[PDB]
Amino acid sequence: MVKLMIIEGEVVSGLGEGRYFLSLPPYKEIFKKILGFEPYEGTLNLKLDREFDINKFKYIETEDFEFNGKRFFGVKVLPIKILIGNKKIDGAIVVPKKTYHSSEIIEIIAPMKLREQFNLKDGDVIKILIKGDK
Numbered sequence: 001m002v003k004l005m006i007i008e009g010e011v012v013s014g015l016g017e018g019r020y021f022l023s024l025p026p027y028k029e030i031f032k033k034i035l036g037f038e039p040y041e042g043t044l045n046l047k048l049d050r051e052f053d054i055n056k057f058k059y060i061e062t063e064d065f066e067f068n069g070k071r072f073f074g075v076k077v078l079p080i081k082i083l084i085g086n087k088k089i090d091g092a093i094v095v096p097k098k099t100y101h102s103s104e105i106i107e108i109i110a111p112m113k114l115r116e117q118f119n120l121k122d123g124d125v126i127k128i129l130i131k132g133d134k
């Protein structure tokens with residue numbers, strides 16, 4: 001019962017909001033722990049063929065944090081493989097509980113800035129590979 005989903009998504013730019021959350025040190029740490037890498041401090045948004053459902057997959061989920069008088073909600077994280085060319089890089093789909101962006105926009109995280117390491121630009125279509133269901 002081995003499972004593969006392979007989803008083309010279009011590289012897109014958003015409202016600048018990824019980076020403040022991936023810079024927040026507890027997030028830096030939880031992703032180091034949960035994934036075995038420190039994400040570059042952003043999220044590569046990819047625009048999808050159709051709505052995405054993290055709950056059909058064997059996600060990790062983070063505890064909420066509270067500091068500076070604020071409540072920081074859980075995020076659901078799902079290891080993936082980012083497929084660019086004949087290359088095959090390891091990352092993760094983060095799906096925050098509360099995000100501004102409708103649900104065919106998935107946010108990707110990886111140790112490197114994907115736009116530089118991989119010369120991506122708004123419009124480019126990349127593929128992501130999800131092994132396993134829930």
Ligand SMILES: Cc1cc2nc3c(=O)[nH]c(=O)nc-3n(C[C@H](O)[C@H](O)[C@H](O)COP(=O)(O)O)c2cc1C
Pocket residue numbers: 014015016017018019021022027043045071072073075094096098099100101107
């Ligand atoms: C790791 C992570 C944690 C987030 N935590 C919160 C949060 O606690 N509260 C909130 O309103 N949005 C949270 N967001 C979602 C952002 O507010 C925003 O909707 C969007 O995902 C930021 O990415 P963007 O600028 O690439 O579109 C989080 C996003 C990520 C990547």
Ligand SMILES: Nc1ccn([C@@H]2O[C@H](COP(=O)(O)OP(=O)(O)O)[C@@H](O)[C@H]2O)c(=O)n1
Pocket residue numbers: 012013014015016017018019020040041042043044045108109110111112113114115116
């Ligand atoms: N691993 C990553 C994370 C973000 N990014 C990009 O880094 C910039 C910072 O990401 P962001 O999520 O804060 O901003 P947007 O995704 O809203 O454009 C954006 O251009 C992302 O597309 C990247 O190239 N590689």
Ligand SMILES: [Cl-]
Pocket residue numbers: 012013014122
């Ligand atoms: Cl755009």
Ligand SMILES: [Mg+2]
Pocket residue numbers: 014017018042043044045107
């Ligand atoms: Mg982003």
